[PDB]
Amino acid sequence: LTQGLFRGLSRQETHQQLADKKGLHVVEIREECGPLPIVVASPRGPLRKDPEPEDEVPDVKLDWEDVKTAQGMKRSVWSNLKRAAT
Amino acid sequence: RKTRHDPLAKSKIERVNMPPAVDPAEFFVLMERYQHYRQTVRALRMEFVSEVQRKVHEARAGVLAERKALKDAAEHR
Amino acid sequence: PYPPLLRAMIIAERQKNGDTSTEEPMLNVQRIRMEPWDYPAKQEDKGRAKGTPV
Amino acid sequence: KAYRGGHLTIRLALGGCTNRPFYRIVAAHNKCPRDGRFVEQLGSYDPLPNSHGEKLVALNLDRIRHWIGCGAHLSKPMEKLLGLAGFFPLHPMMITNAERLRRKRAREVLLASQKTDAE
Amino acid sequence: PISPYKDEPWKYLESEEYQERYGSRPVWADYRRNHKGGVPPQRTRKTCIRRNKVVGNPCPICRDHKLHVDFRNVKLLEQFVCAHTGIIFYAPYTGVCVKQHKRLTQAIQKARDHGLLIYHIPQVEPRDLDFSTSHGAVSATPPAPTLVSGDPWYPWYNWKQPPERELSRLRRLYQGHLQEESGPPPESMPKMP
Amino acid sequence: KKVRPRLIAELARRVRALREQLNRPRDSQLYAVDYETLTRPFSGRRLPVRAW
Amino acid sequence: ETKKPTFMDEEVQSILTKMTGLNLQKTFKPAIQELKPPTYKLMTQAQLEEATRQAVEAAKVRLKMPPVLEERVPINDVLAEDKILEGTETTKYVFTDISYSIPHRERFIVVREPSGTLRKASWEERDRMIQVYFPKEGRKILTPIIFKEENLRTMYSQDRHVDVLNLCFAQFEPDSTEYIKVHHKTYEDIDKRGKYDLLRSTRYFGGMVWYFVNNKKIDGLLIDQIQRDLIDDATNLVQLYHVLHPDGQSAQGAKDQAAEGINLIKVFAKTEAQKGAYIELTLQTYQEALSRHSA
Amino acid sequence: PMKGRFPIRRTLQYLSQGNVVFKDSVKVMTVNYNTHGELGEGARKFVFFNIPQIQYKNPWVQIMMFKNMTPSPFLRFYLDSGEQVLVDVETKSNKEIMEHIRKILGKNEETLREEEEEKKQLSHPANFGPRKYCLRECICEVEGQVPCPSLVPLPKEMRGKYKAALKA
Amino acid sequence: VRSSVHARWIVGKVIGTKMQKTAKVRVTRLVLDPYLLKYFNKRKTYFAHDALQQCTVGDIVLLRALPVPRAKHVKHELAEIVFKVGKVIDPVTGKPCAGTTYLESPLSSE
RNA sequence: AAUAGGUUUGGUCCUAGCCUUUCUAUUAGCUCUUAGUAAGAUUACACAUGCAAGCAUCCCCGUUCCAGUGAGUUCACCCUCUAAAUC
Ligand code: FES
Ligand SMILES: [K+]
Ligand SMILES: [K+]
Ligand SMILES: [K+]
Ligand SMILES: [Mg+2]
Ligand SMILES: [Mg+2]
Ligand SMILES: [Mg+2]
Ligand SMILES: [Mg+2]
Ligand SMILES: [Mg+2]
Ligand SMILES: [Mg+2]
Ligand SMILES: [Zn+2]
């Protein structure tokens, strides 16, 4: 668990790295801030002119636990329990 | 409550229900008021019945309903 | 006359639709023929005591 | 539950708790339980005065007119509510009970005056 | 004991005694509930002060008698509200007993109602699309003739003395079961002098 | 799903209806009255006081 | 003949819309509420300019000014006086028509008094009854205590004038007497303390200007606009003042002198302005700094 | 992870994103498509991605598929009147097929907005009852009204226990 | 136009012709699996009146509901043979086809 | 099953069952101050006694409802058609 945790956390791509890799702006949308677009990272090199392709349907693998929860089908007496501040 | 098959209570066998006493002046006045009240309410009920029937006919064969039906049929063709 | 609230609603609807008539709403009771309560009822539609002699 | 005969009635269904009555105005089959299945709710009646000293009565007049127009009867307490609202004429017994209260208080006032006169 | 801040509770949080005991962390930062298992009970204890006696592990509020839950001590109340969401922490979050959590929730709401504690107030839309006040519901209705003349809405609202022949007919019909004949009622409702 | 026929219920229904037409009480039985007690001997029910 | 403009005239709305301003950082300030993890999009410079354009459109909706209405006239209409019911009840009945598809200002709400009088409910009873049966989010049946004078001064001391107006808008109808009294007390506290920037980029700035212009107290707002290099707004303020006060000393002076631009503020400062001296000085300073930048 | 390619298709969020709600006339929709051929690719993606969305929004419309029965792909709709609508889909993308059948046989946004409004009339805010059906169960939940005795005991004068005691 | 039959128009495949003037038709509908949220074919059998006995096992037919059922299980009539088994006519071009190949080219009649 | 935890071995890793911690209900033990409110036979076993349906100028109407139970158990929902009943 410790070795896996540190591997995952060391291998995360930042927003600046994502912008540099794709030469596009990274825009953050917050529901608390409404439709205001917040640029979090911009590429240091040239900025692409061609929009990123919009695949109508992404072929990304989903976790059934995440999907089952969003659909209200996840029932657990142990989930979302009140606990001390951590 | 009891069913028609249940037997009558014995403590109530000899009970005789004596009708109330009548005040002739109040009795006659109240009798007339019920006639007038119920005539007025029957007239209101008739109007409410006509409104319900009118709205049913209007929604089925009204001008706005037959017009929208032809429009939908024309848009379909 | 109409009841006090029913009359106010009928008059208010007139004004919303642009009618400016000052005529008083009236409830027609000519068609409501009030029979006496002792008027002979229809015996054909009346029931009959069922057989269970004591 | 198909009942033998019967009809729809606009009446008061009692809710609330002990010593705290609250009425829902509902159109329901007369044979149905007082607080059971109903066809439509047509308003509410709080018989207890609120902080502003008011008894609140909600009336869905559009739907009450609909159900009366569809053959619904009226319970006597509901007819009196409509009399107070001005939607129906004052019920004959609302008028009669008012006259009785006047005659009753006219006798108490006379008795009080006769006692003070003796004193 | 007797706290000298009961009248001005906000002063305790500005004193040196407070800063040494809590610093800049919340008063509940170092509190830990004692319970069996890894998952704690979903309710905290009912109260830490029972008949003037304190339990062995008093909650953050009950363990310091100088902390006064009051709608004016806004600096203390802020410690039990999330700064990012504005929600009041549930009692297991901080470990406060149910008694003090209710007092905190009431003080927090009272401070907001008084304007002493800032909270998010959204921008709402108007109730009505049209603001016209011309409709009869909110304007004058033409008075009815009976109302102008001062008559009852319907004539049968009034008492009309019935004829003597009609009263004799009812005395014959109900002979032997009659009350005394009532006359016209008072014109107004009497009153006890 | 095919409800089993209930023959005894239909049989009894007809027998009851038949017996109610062949053993029907006559006006002389239903509407007789004892003028001393003011009761109907067919049912033993008293008449209303205002009819006495 | 010649009608004076209304608050909702296109000419007035355009003037007040620009004087209000649009600041996307303030208009879309992060709200302190239940949060969700944010989403991220990869955008080109064009896709970003479009998303920012859509935000400006969403902001112009959020800045839509509420209409300024005059106080509603008390309702005192008797439908019937059934005196036979006098003394039969001790408490009055309030009857509310709850038919769903009726505008709330067209709903008959009547009151049967213990005297037997059937009368239309008062404006206060109406808004209370509409909240009981048609509860609106953010509105309370009983008036919150925040609107008491002692509690508004607390909110003003914290510079929370916009929260006061958001609470008043949610609680009271725009033509209510409480709605107008609170707005007027809020506008006056802004004028006294020079807090006009608290309402910029909000839907409440125009109503505040409308109040000052009609009450001939634009001297404070005009100074604030000059000190902030908003002469375009300061010049529009003086023009809006003349439009709503055509037969005035300043409006004639502008006609006689054919004043335009900064000259309007000088004409207004001398004739009608109460703080005419402080405006000329504040305006003089501005022209200097503008010359220093030019040179 | 969720089994199969494009598991997003097996989520309620995806299925509710269909914009084709057929008019009541439509009773049966047959899809004839070919498994191979570059000109029948849109029909294959239409079957793969959108048929589930169409069925989700139109549960009572029969949808039947037929493979390699004809040289080109086409959709055919059977209406209650007895009329048949043949839609040729060869060379068309799946997004164009969805937009085509929406135009000729789908309910417009106005017709759907109306239906949603009529549904709101069923839940009147002024009605009291269980939370499943109404906002509030009792008038005691309204501020200013006499609260429930389970929370605030009533005055002795408003309780029948003491009304009878004094009267008796 | 009214009918007491629930299924007014249905398409199915003829799976039996052993009854006189009656075709046994398998009708499939898509049914959502609530747990998997995947659609699976659910098949149901319908008897359809075929007066001319023109239905062959395997052809796709369109069924129309009768006003009232004519038999215990016969609630529909043959309305149209959509795809005759082995004799399909391409509806898009009107030419005969054998699978994905034309038997007569659409260019014959221009 | 969760933010998980304990437990196989001389030891480790993996798999796996069991149990722990959470929240309700019933019963048992021991213990128990007040007020308000809600809820309240284990048993479709047998039942002492009382009461639970009358109304009304006779006809009729009502006692076919309400109240009860959970034995049996895809008669409950939608459409079509059409009685009785209310207007
Ligand atoms: S639930 Fe309203 S009085 Fe108890
Ligand atoms: K284990
Ligand atoms: K027990
Ligand atoms: K059972
Ligand atoms: Mg082992
Ligand atoms: Mg070993
Ligand atoms: Mg116990
Ligand atoms: Mg029952
Ligand atoms: Mg059992
Ligand atoms: Mg009939
Ligand atoms: Zn504590």
Numbering used by the authors:
A (entry chain D): 345 to 430
B (entry chain U): 27 to 103
C (entry chain 0): 165 to 218
D (entry chain M): 10 to 128
E (entry chain O): 47 to 239
F (entry chain 0): 4 to 55
G (entry chain R): 64 to 358
H (entry chain T): 2 to 169
What does the paper say about this structure?
We also identified a class with mS37 and mtIF3 without RBFA and refined it to 2.9 Å resolution. Therefore, the arrival of mS37 disrupts the RBFA–mtIF3 contact, and RBFA is eliminated to finalize the assembly. The finding of the mtIF3 as an assembly factor features a new paradigm of a unique protein, mS37, that links the assembly to the initiation of translation, and additional transient intermediates are likely to exist.
Mitoribosomes are essential for the synthesis and maintenance of bioenergetic proteins. Here we use cryo-electron microscopy to determine a series of the small mitoribosomal subunit (SSU) intermediates in complex with auxiliary factors, revealing a sequential assembly mechanism. In this study, we determined sequential cryo-electron microscopy (cryo-EM) structures of stable assembly intermediates and initiation complexes at 2.8–3.2 Å resolution that involve six factors: RBFA, TFB1M, METTL15, mtIF3, mS37 and mtIF2. In conclusion, the model for the SSU progression through the assembly pathway includes a sequence of binding factors as an integrated network, with RBFA serving as a regulator through its allosteric control mechanism, which was not reported in a bacterial counterpart.
